[PDB]
């Protein structure tokens, strides 16, 4: 934060197929620490996706994922008090991180039923990238190019 | 809501009540036993129950019986 260097803590790979990326994805969707249940959702939801599209678990995932990955984003520069939003390329880590985050977010709404299904459908919409999550991505890209006058 | 091992009362009050009953509807009793539960024989009596700065008389109407005397002497005055 200040001077302190970060210790990019290691994340254990997912048990059913060592996808450390998905592992952290669970960690995002996870709530109150009941990781087992979180993992239960992520799985059944992932299967339902694989079932659905016809694509296998994770491969369908990143395909559904990249289609929401922000490339840039606003940031608040100022000069003594003159605050104004600034576009800036996102870190790849922070990139897919924000991707999963927004995905879980749009998943928070869209009251179909169980999270597994609601999430499944969100990623499914990402498969053709027209779901609510991508609405966030576009919005941020507008927040970029409709402000791309800073560097 | 409690003490189902003989409804609770007071020797001085009880005896004062019996003494009154067998003596007829005499002068109102002036007990401080707000703890005292009412008993059947009490009906008709006008026992006064101190409640801080009075004795607020209460006729022992039929209804009340299991009720403790305090419930008939409001203590905190308001408006």
């Amino acid at each position: 934060p200040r001077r302190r260097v970060i210790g990019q803590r290691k994340i254990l790979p997912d048990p059913k197929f060592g996808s450390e990326l998905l592992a952290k994805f669970v960690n995002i969707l996870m709530v109150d620490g009941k990781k087992s249940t979180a993992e239960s959702i992520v799985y059944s939801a992932l299967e339902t996706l694989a079932q659905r599209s016809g694509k296998s678990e994770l491969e369908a995932f990143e395909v559904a994922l990249e289609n929401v990955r922000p490339t840039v984003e606003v940031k608040s520069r100022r000069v003594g008090g003159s605050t104004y939003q600034v576009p800036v390329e996102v870190r790849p880590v922070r990139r897919n991180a924000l991707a999963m985050r927004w995905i879980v977010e749009a998943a928070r709404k869209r009251g179909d039923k169980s999270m597994a299904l609601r999430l499944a459908n969100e990623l499914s919409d990402a498969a053709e990238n027209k779901g609510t999550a991508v609405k966030k991505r576009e919005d941020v890209h507008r927040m970029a190019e409709a402000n791309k006058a800073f560097a | 809501r409690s003490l189902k091992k003989g409804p609770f009362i007071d020797l001085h009050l009880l005896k004062k009540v019996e003494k009154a009953v067998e003596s007829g509807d005499k002068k109102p009793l002036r007990t401080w036993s707000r703890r005292s539960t009412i008993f059947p024989n009490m009906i008709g009596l006008t026992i006064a129950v101190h409640n801080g700065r009075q004795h607020v008389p209460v006729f022992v109407t039929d209804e009340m019986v299991g009720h403790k005397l305090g419930e008939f002497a409001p203590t905190r005055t308001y408006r």
């Binding site: - | 509807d25 002068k27 109102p28 006008t46 700065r53 009075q54 004795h55 008389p57 006729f59 409001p74």
Partner: protein
Amino acid sequence: QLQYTPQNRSKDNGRVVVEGVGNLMHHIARCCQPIPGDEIVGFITQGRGISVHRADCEQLAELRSHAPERIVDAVWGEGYSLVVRVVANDRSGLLRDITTILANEKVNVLGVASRSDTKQQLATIDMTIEIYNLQVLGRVLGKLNQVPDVIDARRLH
């Protein structure tokens, strides 16, 4: 502008001692404004404790027409607030006559009640006060009767 101390003494106990018992939730009536006159007669009320509804009064007798067991005697031992109807033969600033005598009088006068023109041209002021020595009552009343326009000036029950 000058409108409980007189009843803060009853709230300080004493006065009424029904059948020889002290410190009771007594409280003076209204239709009858008992003072240590024809003694008084008590009446137990559900809430409010004992009601000192004066000795010999209709509403008291009504209660004598219902639950006699509730009825009880009354005493005094060691009197406040009353109302005296004092009808005037119309005023027009003649309330001043009433307003005049108030000085040497030492009782506080709470609510200055009145009325007049409804029918025969003649006012009918009534007055709440706070009596002390019962003698002082008699000491004052005549002065009220004295004023010529004051045809009526006796205690109202």
